């Protein structure tokens, strides 16, 4: 099945996504730096870019930078004078991400903050940051419950929240699993349901990265 899903994704990108030497280099540098290949796929990246454009987002919060691949897709969807604030725990990942954001000529609208996301989120609250209108949660999924609460806290009515990798090859329905990622993801779904101010759905996806999925939520 992975061969078929990968072939379909190759077809989709070949026809709908013009070759982009900049983004290809980002992945190449990530690999050279030994960063894991956990970036969103090209089709997922374009989905994010287009969703940002549909929302007309101007203040994006991303949790989990890696090498800035998703960050570039997101930043490219920004309105006028919008910006992206992305959080990364690894000093090395963050350094590489900054270099890739530089190679994409987006350093004028993207800020990479190094440190554990929970600590950075508190700092963001402490500082004078306007509410975020688009939030992409893509870090350590075991912490999704806390990231969701922070996302809502730092949101405004109409804010879009995308939570990546929330199906995990179907492990999401294994209620007895002792895996913290699975339990964290399940609590993420539950907390969204508990919040009357948030309405969401989740689509299961397949492609070059395998069988997974994402949550798309909107703050009332």
Ligand X SMILES: Nc1ncnc2c1ncn2[C@@H]1O[C@H](CSCC[C@H](N)C(=O)O)[C@@H](O)[C@H]1O
CA atoms of 166 and 189, how far apart (whole Å): 9
54 is a site residue for a second copy (CB under 8 A): yes
Interface pattern 122-151 for ligand X (x via CB under 6 A)? ----------------xxx--x--------
Has 147 been labeled as part of a binding site?
Answer: yes
DSSP character string of 44-55 = HHHHHHHHHHHH
70 is a contact residue toward ligand X (CB under 6 A): yes
Angle between helices 117-126 and 144-153 (to 10 degrees): 10
**In the complex, what is the shortest distance from the CB of residue 167 to a second copy, in angstroms, rounded to a whole number?**
6
Provide the H-helix boundaries in 33-90: 42-55, 69-75
104 with 110: CB under 8 angstroms? no
Q: Verify binding: residue 11, a second copy, rule CB under 8 A.
A: yes
CA 183 to chain centre: 19
Q: Note the residue count of the chain.
A: 220
Residue 47: C-alpha distances to residues 52, 74, 84 (Å): 9, 9, 17
Nearer CB in complex with ligand X: 25/140: 140
What whole-number distance in Å separates Cα of residue 7 and Cα of residue 5?
5
Among 90, 99, 107, 177, binds ligand X (CB under 6 A): 90
**Phi, psi angles (nearest 5°) of residue 218:** -130, 135
Among a second copy, ligand X, none, partner that 145 touches (CB below 5 to 8 angstroms by kind): none
Region 169-188 residues binding a second copy, contact defined as CB under 8 A: 170, 172-173
- Residue numbers in the known binding site for S-adenosyl-L-homocysteine are 40, 66, 70, 88, 93, 117, 140, 147
Site residues, a second copy (CB under 8 A): 4-5, 7-9, 11-12, 15-17, 43-44, 46-47, 50-51, 53-55, 158, 160, 167, 170, 172-173, 189-190, 192-193, 199-207, 211, 213, 215-218
Site residues, ligand X (CB under 6 A): 38-40, 64-67, 69-70, 87-90, 93, 116-117, 138-140, 143
């Amino acid at each position: 099945m992975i061969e078929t899903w990968t072939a379909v994704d190759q077809y989709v990108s070949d026809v709908l996504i013009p070759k982009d030497s900049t983004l290809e280099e980002v992945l190449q540098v990530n690999a050279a730096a030994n960063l894991p290949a956990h970036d969103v796929s090209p089709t997922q990246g374009k989905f994010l870019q287009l969703l940002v454009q549909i929302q007309g987002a101007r203040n994006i919060l991303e949790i989990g930078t890696l090498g800035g691949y998703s960050t570039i897709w997101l930043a490219r969807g920004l309105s006028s004078g919008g910006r992206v604030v992305t959080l990364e725990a690894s000093e090395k990942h963050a350094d590489i991400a900054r270099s890739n954001i530089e190679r994409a000529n987006l350093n004028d609208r993207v800020e990479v903050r190094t440190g554990l996301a929970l600590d950075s989120l508190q700092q963001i609250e402490n500082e004078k940051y306007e509410p975020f209108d688009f939030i992409f949660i893509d870090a350590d999924k075991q912490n999704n419950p806390a990231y969701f609460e922070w996302a809502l806290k730092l949101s405004r009515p109409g804010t879009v929240i995308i939570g990546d990798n929330v199906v995990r090859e179907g492990e999401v329905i294994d209620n007895t699993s002792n895996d913290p990622r699975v339990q964290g993801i399940r609590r993420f779904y539950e907390l969204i349901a508990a919040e009357p101010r948030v309405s969401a759905t989740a689509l299961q996806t397949v492609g070059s990265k395998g069988y997974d999925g994402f949550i798309m939520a909107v703050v009332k």
